Amino acid sequence: VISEKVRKALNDQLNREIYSSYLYLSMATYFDAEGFKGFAHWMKKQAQEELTHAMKFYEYIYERGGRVELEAIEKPPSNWNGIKDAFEAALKHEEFVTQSIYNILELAHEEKDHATVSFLKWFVDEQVEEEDQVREILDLLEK
Amino acid sequence: VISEKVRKALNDQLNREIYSSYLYLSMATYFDAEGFKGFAHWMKKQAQEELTHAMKFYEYIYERGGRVELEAIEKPPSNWNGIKDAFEAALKHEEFVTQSIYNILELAHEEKDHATVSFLKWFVDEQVEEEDQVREILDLLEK
Ligand SMILES: [Fe+3]
Ligand SMILES: [Fe+3]
C-alpha cells in the first residue's frame, strides 16, 4: 500500500502528464495553423504518448490501493516564434517533467517504496529518450 | 471556408468534447475507487470516444481553413451518490452536449454552411445512440 504522500505525488504527476499531453496538442494546433503537417503529426503522437503515460499512472495508483482525483488543466500557450522555438519549449517542458519524476523518485526512496521506484524508472528513461529525439530534431534544423 | 462565427462555435465545441472526455474519466476514477471495474471500464471507453470526437472536430476545423485554440479544462466532479447517480449525470451531460451541437447546426443552417451541417449530423446521431445506451443501463439497474 502506498503512503498518502507518495499517492499525492503520483496524483499530482498524473495531472502533470495530462497537461503535458495538452501542451503538445497545443503545439500541434500551432504547427497545423502554419501548415507544418509533419511537425504537427509529431506533436500529436507525443500528445498521445503522454496520455498513455498518464493512464499508466492511473492504473498504478489503483493497483497500490489509492485513488485518482482529476484537477483543472491550465490553458496552454497556443503560439510560438517559429519551429525551433516550439521545440525548445518542448525540450524545456520535458526537462521539467523529468525533474518532477525525479522528485517522486527521491520521495519513494525515502519511504523505501521500492515498487514505486521501479515503476517510475521506466518513465525517466522514456523522458530522456524523448529529450534526445527533440535534441536531434533541433540539431537537424540548425541554422 | 468557414465563417468566423461557425469556427468559434466549432472551437468551443471541441473544448466541450475534451471536457466531456475528462468528465467520463473522472466518473471512472469514482467507479474504480469503489471497485466497480466494469462500470469504470465503460467510462474509460466513453472518455476515449469523446477524445476521438474532439480530434474529428480538430481535423475538420483545419480542413475548412480555421485553426484550433485550446482552452482551460475545468475540474470535473470526482464523486457521485452511487452507480445510478453517476449514470444519470452522464445522461444529463450527454443531453447538454446534444443541445450544444444542435445550436451549432442551427447556426450552420443560418449561414447556409451545408458541409458543417453534414459534418455535425454524424455527432448528433452518435450522441442519441449513446444516450440510448445509458438509458438501457439505467433501465437494467432499476430498483
Ligand atoms: Fe511522460
Ligand atoms: Fe460526443
Side-chain angles (χ1 to χ4, degrees):
Chain A
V1 61
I2 42 57
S3 64
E4 179 163 285
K5 303 121 280 183
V6 169
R7 186 234 69 102
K8 211 80 59 213
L10 293 171
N11 193 69
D12 284 355
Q13 192 55 30
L14 183 153
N15 287 279
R16 278 203 283 269
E17 306 283 328
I18 303 267
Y19 175 76
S20 292
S21 178
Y22 207 44
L23 175 64
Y24 294 139
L25 185 61
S26 192
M27 285 173 180
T29 73
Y30 162 78
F31 284 139
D32 269 323
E34 302 239 338
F36 290 81
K37 320 176 26 166
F39 290 130
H41 188 249
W42 188 96
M43 285 297 170
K44 292 169 203 163
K45 292 323 104 154
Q46 203 59 222
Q48 183 155 0
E49 287 174 12
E50 294 301 277
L51 197 60
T52 297
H53 298 351
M55 292 310 296
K56 302 276 190 23
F57 274 73
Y58 183 117
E59 302 297 340
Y60 178 77
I61 288 164
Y62 283 102
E63 289 172 23
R64 297 286 315 267
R67 71 157 297 167
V68 168
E69 186 181 8
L70 296 177
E71 299 303 329
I73 307 302
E74 303 217 282
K75 179 181 168 169
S78 62
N79 285 111
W80 287 263
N81 271 64
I83 305 325
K84 182 192 329 300
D85 188 52
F87 277 95
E88 297 263 39
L91 176 53
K92 187 168 155 208
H93 183 77
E94 289 162 341
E95 293 163 343
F96 164 81
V97 178
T98 300
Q99 174 72 91
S100 299
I101 293 174
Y102 213 64
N103 288 335
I104 309 170
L105 220 38
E106 167 61 23
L107 176 65
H109 277 296
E110 283 178 356
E111 313 200 342
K112 273 140 210 53
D113 183 349
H114 303 272
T116 294
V117 169
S118 291
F119 173 78
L120 292 175
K121 204 50 172 192
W122 183 94
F123 292 94
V124 179
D125 301 339
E126 197 276 337
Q127 278 297 129
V128 188
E129 182 214 309
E130 206 53 55
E131 291 182 16
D132 285 0
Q133 283 184 230
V134 173
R135 278 192 237 264
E136 175 51 39
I137 286 170
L138 286 165
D139 289 332
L140 205 59
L141 299 177
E142 237 167 43
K143 196 162 210 22
Chain B
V1 61
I2 42 57
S3 64
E4 179 163 285
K5 303 121 280 183
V6 169
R7 186 234 69 102
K8 211 80 59 213
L10 293 171
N11 193 69
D12 284 355
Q13 192 55 30
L14 183 153
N15 287 279
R16 278 203 283 269
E17 306 283 328
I18 303 267
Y19 175 76
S20 292
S21 178
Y22 207 44
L23 175 64
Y24 294 139
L25 185 61
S26 192
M27 285 173 180
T29 73
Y30 162 78
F31 284 139
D32 269 323
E34 302 239 338
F36 290 81
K37 320 176 26 166
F39 290 130
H41 188 249
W42 188 96
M43 285 297 170
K44 292 169 203 163
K45 292 323 104 154
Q46 203 59 222
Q48 183 155 0
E49 287 174 12
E50 294 301 277
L51 197 60
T52 297
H53 298 351
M55 292 310 296
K56 302 276 190 23
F57 274 73
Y58 183 117
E59 302 297 340
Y60 178 77
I61 288 164
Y62 283 102
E63 289 172 23
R64 297 286 315 267
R67 71 157 297 167
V68 168
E69 186 181 8
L70 296 177
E71 299 303 329
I73 307 302
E74 303 217 282
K75 179 181 168 169
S78 62
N79 285 111
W80 287 263
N81 271 64
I83 305 325
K84 182 192 329 300
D85 188 52
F87 277 95
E88 297 263 39
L91 176 53
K92 187 168 155 208
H93 183 77
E94 289 162 341
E95 293 163 343
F96 164 81
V97 178
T98 300
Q99 174 72 91
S100 299
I101 293 174
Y102 213 64
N103 288 335
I104 309 170
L105 220 38
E106 167 61 23
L107 176 65
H109 277 296
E110 283 178 356
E111 313 200 342
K112 273 140 210 53
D113 183 349
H114 303 272
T116 294
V117 169
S118 291
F119 173 78
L120 292 175
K121 204 50 172 192
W122 183 94
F123 292 94
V124 179
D125 301 339
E126 197 276 337
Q127 278 297 129
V128 188
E129 182 214 309
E130 206 53 55
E131 291 182 16
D132 285 0
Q133 283 184 230
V134 173
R135 278 192 237 264
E136 175 51 39
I137 286 170
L138 286 165
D139 289 332
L140 205 59
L141 299 177
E142 237 167 43
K143 196 162 210 22

